[PDB]
């Protein structure tokens, strides 16, 4: 079956005065592989991919601030806040060069960090990643009405904060196969207290859709432009129908991105890791063996 356990010893590091939790497994030397989750997940989303990689490479998987087992400061939980904390996490572990494996808002962090630190990125594997969505028509039809509602202060907070819709509704709708209760309970655990749900609401309000917020559109356009001019090895996983990255978009990127291999993981929405962890993990391990690391 698909594993439901999380058999990783907890590690913590102090970051801007807060403790951040992270997985750290695999060999001690070499180039580490840094796995960045997004909304509304945690390092749990990588639990069945890490074991394919850990035999050959160090795997580091932090929980974003306010998420997973990381601390919950008083924060806006803006993308800008996550940039400060992730920048500081990477320096607090003393990382030098890395390979990135990134998803959803973790991909916006990873691509933005790579743009600003290009000499330190030896490869990027990515899936269901943040790109500009120029109009609402380019958001999947089945999810337009809900994300339009999320992007309000009254109805959106009632849904996501009061009723925990991103965890109880949106997350399962991002997986083709049924999630089981152990898996849901791991995703629920950081958010049992409603007042701890601000990241889950601020994130969809940061998504670059139909030109807003314009600062996030600008930041994401910048790292997409960087990506298209970078020789860094790239590995793109995509599913059908997808959510952020539909098949036609994956095919465009497979053509336009330098040094990019694309892999079709079969049926998939947003949390591709939950529908096909073994192909994602085995293809990352293979690709790592071809990098000059």
- Residues near Mg ion (CB under 5 A) are 73
What is the residue whose two structure tokens read 């899936």? Answer: 127
**Cis omega (within 30 of 0) for bond into 40:** yes
Give, as ranges, the residues between 137 and 196 that touch ligand PJI (CB under 6 A).
143, 145-146, 149, 159, 163, 165, 168-170, 173-174
18-25 sheet: strands from edge to edge: 11-15, 18-25, 59-62, 33-36, 98-104, 121-129, 234-241, 260-268
117 binds ligand PJI (CB under 6 A): no
Q: Which is nearer to ligand PJI, 8 or 129 (CB)?
A: 129
Alpha carbons 144 and 140: distance in angstroms, whole number:
6
Least separation in angstroms between residue 160's CB and Cl ion is 10
Radius of gyration from C-alpha coordinates of the chain: 17
Least separation in angstroms between residue 207's CB and Cl ion is 5
Q: What's the half-sphere exposure (Cβ side, CA atoms, 13 Å) at 245?
A: 27
Least separation in angstroms between residue 28's CB and ligand PJI is 33
Least separation in angstroms between residue 143's CB and ligand PJI is 3
Least separation in angstroms between residue 174's CB and ligand PJI is 3
Please tell me the count of residues contacting ligand PJI according to CB under 6 A: 20
Residue nearest to Mg ion (CB): 73
38 binds ligand PJI (CB under 6 A): yes
245 binds ligand PJI (CB under 6 A): no
Give, as ranges, the residues between 1 and 20 that touch ligand PJI (CB under 6 A).
none
**Cis omega (within 30 of 0) for bond into 213:** yes
- Token code pair at residue 176: 């083709």
Q: Which is nearer to Mg ion, 26 or 68 (CB)?
A: 68
Count of C-beta atoms within a 10 Å radius of residue 122: 18
Among ligand PJI, Mg ion, Cl ion, none, partner that 146 touches (CB below 5 to 8 angstroms by kind): ligand PJI
Q: Judging by beta carbons within 10 Å of its beta carbon (0-12, 13-18, 19+), is residue 162 exposed, middle or buried?
A: exposed
Give residues in contact with ligand PJI (CB under 6 A): 38-39, 104-105, 143, 145-146, 149, 159, 163, 165, 168-170, 173-174, 243-244, 269-270
């Amino acid at each position: 079956g698909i594993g439901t356990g999380f058999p990783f010893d907890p590690h913590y590091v102090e970051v801007l005065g807060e403790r951040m939790h992270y997985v750290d497994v695999g060999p001690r030397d070499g180039t580490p592989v840094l796995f960045l989750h997004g909304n509304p997940t945690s390092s749990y989303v990588w639990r069945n991919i890490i074991p394919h990689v850990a035999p050959t490479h160090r795997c580091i998987a932090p929980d974003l601030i306010g998420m997973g087992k990381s601390d919950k400061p008083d924060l806006g939980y803006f993308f800008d806040d996550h940039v400060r904390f992730m920048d500081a996490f990477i320096e607090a572990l003393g990382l030098e060069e890395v390979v990135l494996v990134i998803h959803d808002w973790g991909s916006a962090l990873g691509f933005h960090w790579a743009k600003r630190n290009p000499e330190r990125v030896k490869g990027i594997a990515f899936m269901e990643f943040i790109r500009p969505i120029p109009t609402w028509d380019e958001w999947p039809e089945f999810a337009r009405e809900t994300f339009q509602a999320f992007r309000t202060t009254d109805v959106g907070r009632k849904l996501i904060i009061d009723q925990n819709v991103f965890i109880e509704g949106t997350l399962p709708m991002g997986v083709v196969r049924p999630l089981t209760e152990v898996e849901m309970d791991h995703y629920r655990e950081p958010f049992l207290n409603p007042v701890d749900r601000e990241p889950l609401w601020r994130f969809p309000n940061e998504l670059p859709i139909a030109g807003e917020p314009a600062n996030i559109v600008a930041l994401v356009e910048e790292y997409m432009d960087w990506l298209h001019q970078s020789p860094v090895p790239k590995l793109l996983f995509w599913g059908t129908p997808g959510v952020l990255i539909p098949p036609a978009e994956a095919a465009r990127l497979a053509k336009s991105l330098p040094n990019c291999k694309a892999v079709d993981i079969g049926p998939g929405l947003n949390l591709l890791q939950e529908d096909n962890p073994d192909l994602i993990g085995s293809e990352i391990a293979r690709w790592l063996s071809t990098l000059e690391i």
